[PDB]
Each structure stands twice: as structure tokens, then as C-alpha cells.
Symmetry: C3
Subunit: 73 residues, 3 copies
Amino acid sequence: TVQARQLLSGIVQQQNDLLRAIEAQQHLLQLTVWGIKQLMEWDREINNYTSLIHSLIEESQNQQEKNEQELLE
Amino acid sequence: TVQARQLLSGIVQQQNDLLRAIEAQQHLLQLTVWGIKQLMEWDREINNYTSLIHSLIEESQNQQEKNEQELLE
Amino acid sequence: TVQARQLLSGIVQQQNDLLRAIEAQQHLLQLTVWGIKQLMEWDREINNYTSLIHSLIEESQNQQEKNEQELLE
């Protein structure tokens, strides 16, 4: 079970890796949106998807916390 | 096994979270590509990676469906 | 255990899917950063997050290799 627990712990760890990666890429995307904005329908779609992504990120964080608590029990 | 099944179900759920997050960020990236385009080698690389990412997204969706069916059995 | 091993193998496979997806999206982001740059505080934040993301990607790759080796044992 110890080796069983270790793989699962590596998988849950990798999900946190991936989520942090996604979060960092969101910061970058918002930076480019800002650059493009410094230089309509586009504004509407930017907002709708930006809203969606932050919502998806929070839910991922919540699920990450649950998975790690479940793994620990 | 019930608590075993629950962690795995949270992990598979988290992968769907992550995939949807990635998909949303793709919509955003395509929006910025569109803004930059409104304002060569760049066009070629945009197309090659855009093609790759949509292919990776579809394969991820296929694998997501399998994982969830396998979890249910 | 065979069906057990298969789900876990699909999950680890899906993490590689997701990581490759994230990597491809990084190539795209860097392309748009390049387009915006062709057309200060912005430069500093771009660099700090670009650095973070490549670091997160390498660590994800390392963890991916471990997870797959652990799965195989």
C-alpha cells in the first residue's frame, strides 16, 4: 500500500503542478491582453472567457484541496 | 474501496477541470492572436501550434471519456 | 488489479496529454508576446511569469517521468 500511496501522491502532486502552470499562463495571457489593449465583440469575448477561466481555476483549487485531504486519509 | 473510489473520482474530476481550463485559455489565446492580427514566419508558427493544441485537446477529451468509463466499471 | 492498473495508466497518460497541451500553449503565448513586442512594468512581469512557467513545466516533466516509472513498478 505504501508504493500504492506513493503513485497516487505523485499524481495528485502533478495535478497541482499542472494547475499552477495553468495559473501562471493566465497571468501571462492577461499581460498580453493588456499589451494588445494598449496598442466591441472582442472585448465581450475576452471578458466572458476570462470570467470562465478564473471560475475554473478556483474550482480546480478547491478540488485540489479535497484530493490531497482524501489522499491523506 | 468506497473511499478508494472517491479519491480516484476526485482525480479524474480534477483532470476534467484542468482540461476545461486549458480549453478556455485556448479561446483566449485565439482572441489575442486575433487582436494582434488586427493591428511570415510568425503566421506559420501560429498555425503549426494552433493545430497541435487542438489535436492535443481532442485526444485529452477522448482519454477523459475513457478514464471516466473505466472508473465507473 | 489489471483493470485497476489500466485506469491509473489512463490517468497518468492524461496528465501527459495535459502537460503537452500546456507546453504547446506556452509556444503560442510566446508567439503573441513576440507579435505585441513587434508592434517597462509589462516587460518585467512577462519575464517573471515566463520564468515561472518554464520552471513549472520542467518540474511537471520530471514528475511525469517518476509517475510513469512508479506505475510500471
